[PDB]
Amino acid sequence: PQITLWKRPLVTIKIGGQLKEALLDTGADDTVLEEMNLPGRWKPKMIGGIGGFIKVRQYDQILIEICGHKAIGTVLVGPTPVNIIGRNLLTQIGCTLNF
Amino acid sequence: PQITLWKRPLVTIKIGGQLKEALLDTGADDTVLEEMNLPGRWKPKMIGGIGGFIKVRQYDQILIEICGHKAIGTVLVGPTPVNIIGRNLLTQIGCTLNF
Numbered sequence: 298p299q300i301t302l303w304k305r306p307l308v309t310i311k312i313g314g315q316l317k318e319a320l321l322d323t324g325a326d327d328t329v330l331e332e333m334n335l336p337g338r339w340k341p342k343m344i345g346g347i348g349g350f351i352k353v354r355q356y357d358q359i360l361i362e363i364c365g366h367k368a369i370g371t372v373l374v375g376p377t378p379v380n381i382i383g384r385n386l387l388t389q390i391g392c393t394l395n396f
Numbered sequence: 397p398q399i400t401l402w403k404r405p406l407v408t409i410k411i412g413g414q415l416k417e418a419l420l421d422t423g424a425d426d427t428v429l430e431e432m433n434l435p436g437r438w439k440p441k442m443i444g445g446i447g448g449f450i451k452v453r454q455y456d457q458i459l460i461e462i463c464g465h466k467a468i469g470t471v472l473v474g475p476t477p478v479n480i481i482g483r484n485l486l487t488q489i490g491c492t493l494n495f
């Protein structure tokens with residue numbers, strides 16, 4: 298599909314057995330999801346943006362379905378105000394910028 | 397152009413007659429540039445990111461050329477970690493997400 302940018306590019310994702318709304322974010326190196334209790338091991342991480350840094354938990358090899366397109370990679374979980382799909386997964390679903 | 401996302405979508409911009417590098421950021425509503433000098437009046441404003449809120453200088457109706465495409469709109473100047481082009485200008489250059 299083609300998504301115009303008049304409004305936030307929010308799409309439905311499926312992760313850890315839950316459906317959620319998330320931003321397709323070309324400005325995000327990594328994928329950052331709102332606090333959720335995923336099972337398995339994780340490693341602490343800090344990611345910075347406008348306003349400073351937040352502490353997140355890094356989970357590896359997590360399956361995510363983005364608008365019906367399957368992907369698997371690293372997912373960060375922490376106190377983000379918005380679910381953010383980063384480039385690590387956008388590449389896997391064939392997402393491109395076009396103008 | 398069609399831009400894949402295996403690297404950061406960084407592009408050259410021209411603003412105030414000066415060239416800079418900026419990130420095409422579909423997760424940003426607004427355009428936020430690092431500290432710089434711009435002519436004209438500005439208003440103090442607040443913007444929030446993943447880590448909190450920062451004070452910025454809002455410049456309205458600013459000419460800015462992005463990868464050879466012209467836009468005229470609001471530019472926020474403040475302590476952002478990187479120059480980001482937000483949807484307010486991405487729409488003006490006809491940018492869309494595609495997968």
Ligand SMILES: CC(C)CN(C[C@@H](O)[C@H](Cc1ccccc1)NC(=O)O[C@H]1CO[C@H]2OCC[C@H]21)S(=O)(=O)c1ccc2c(c1)OCO2
Binds near residue numbers: 325425426478480
């Ligand atoms: C600032 C850029 C370089 C990085 N950010 C991605 C942005 O898309 C961010 C994603 C974002 C969106 C909404 C709330 C919090 C983060 N948007 C943002 O800060 O935009 C601000 C400017 O316009 C306004 O509209 C949105 C907030 C304002 S981010 O959220 O802090 C971020 C995401 C994944 C990351 C990372 C940083 O480091 C490595 O992995």
